[PDB]
Design a binder for this molecule. Structure first.
Ligand SMILES: c1ccc2c(-c3cnn4cc(-c5ccc(N6CCNCC6)cc5)cnc34)ccnc2c1
Length: 296
């Protein structure tokens, strides 16, 4: 029972606030936990995330660990492992990355996404899962400087066995800054599971860029900026993104000094292969994972 794990947790510090609700650092029997208190406008994300975490055997180093879910005037809680560095967004804000570290975050993030995407058969297996809101804010950085993916509120699942896409009822859509061209065009086939995987991949490419920008080479490193920082305002409208990504056919600038290296020459090419306009031309998460370790 998750009931009393919510009852004993003491809330100590609010480490995040937004339209999704709030995230707090909490103490439970000496150890630190994260407690996400959802906003009224995002109740359906709590439901979907509660269903998936209770229903799917998902535990993995590179996926945020689940502890409990509670309905504790009305308020919905999700209690999980706590990670001090916060999100990849937060980490990339303050820290610069040695090439080795850039690859470590990149590979571990790719492990998380591959694990989500790939169906594992058998009693201890899991259906194929697509995230649908992959972004640097929804990836945490652990103590060992490896990533793990969070926020399954919009996830969609599918088995090879039964072809009907398990979709929730959430009105929420993907974060606009990260939406693929086919989502902004509304040309995506919403009854095909592979489509949703291909939008995760697009978004993944954008996260690589964010890591790349913050990586040290020849003692050059840029300050943190989000993807498309040079073409859209802070909370880009769908229409702002539609114009940039579909009409103007823009993709983030690949550092014009991205190819003057061995280990970070490939990252540039891999970035390109997440951003192909035709979704089926894109690399799969498994192929990205493999390439990443293939080059260590
Ligand atoms: C998406 C992402 C995360 C979660 C989480 C979640 C789990 N852990 N965690 C930690 C932070 C966090 C901690 C500390 C900091 N700082 C300390 C270092 N300096 C920068 C500010 C910043 C951020 C935020 N969210 C979470 C729980 C539930 N749903 C999620 C959905």
């Amino acid at each position: 029972m998750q009931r009393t794990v919510a009852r004993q947790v003491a809330l100590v510090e609010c480490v995040g606030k937004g339209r999704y609700g709030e995230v707090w650092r909490g103490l439970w029997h000496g150890e630190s936990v994260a407690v996400k208190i959802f906003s009224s406008r995002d109740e359906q994300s709590w439901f979907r995330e509660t269903e998936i975490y209770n229903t799917v055997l998902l535990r993995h180093d590179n996926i945020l660990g689940f502890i409990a879910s509670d309905m504790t005037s009305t308020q919905l809680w999700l209690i999980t492992h706590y990670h001090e560095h916060g999100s990849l967004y937060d980490f990339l804000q303050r820290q610069t990355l040695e090439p080795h570290l850039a690859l470590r975050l990149a590979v571990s993030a790719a492990c998380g996404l591959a694990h989500l995407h790939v169906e594992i058969f058998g009693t201890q297996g899991k259906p194929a899962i697509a995230h649908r809101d992959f972004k640097s804010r929804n990836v945490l950085v652990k103590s060992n400087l490896q990533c793990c993916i969070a926020d399954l509120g919009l996830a969609v699942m599918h088995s090879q066995g039964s072809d009907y896409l398990d979709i929730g009822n959430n009105p929420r859509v993907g974060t606009k800054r990260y939406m693929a061209p086919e989502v902004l065009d509304e040309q995506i086939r919403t009854d095909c599971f592979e489509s949703y995987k291909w939008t995760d991949i697009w978004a993944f490419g954008l996260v690589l860029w964010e890591i790349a920008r913050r990586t040290i080479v020849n003692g050059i490193v840029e300050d943190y900026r989000p993807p498309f920082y040079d073409v859209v305002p802070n909370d880009p409208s769908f229409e702002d993104m539609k114009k940039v990504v579909c009409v103007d056919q823009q993709t983030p600038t690949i550092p014009n000094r991205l190819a003057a290296d061995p280990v970070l020459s490939g990252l540039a090419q891999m970035m390109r292969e997440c951003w192909y306009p035709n979704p089926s031309a894109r690399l799969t998460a498994l192929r990205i994972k493999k390439t990443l370790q293939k080059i260590s």
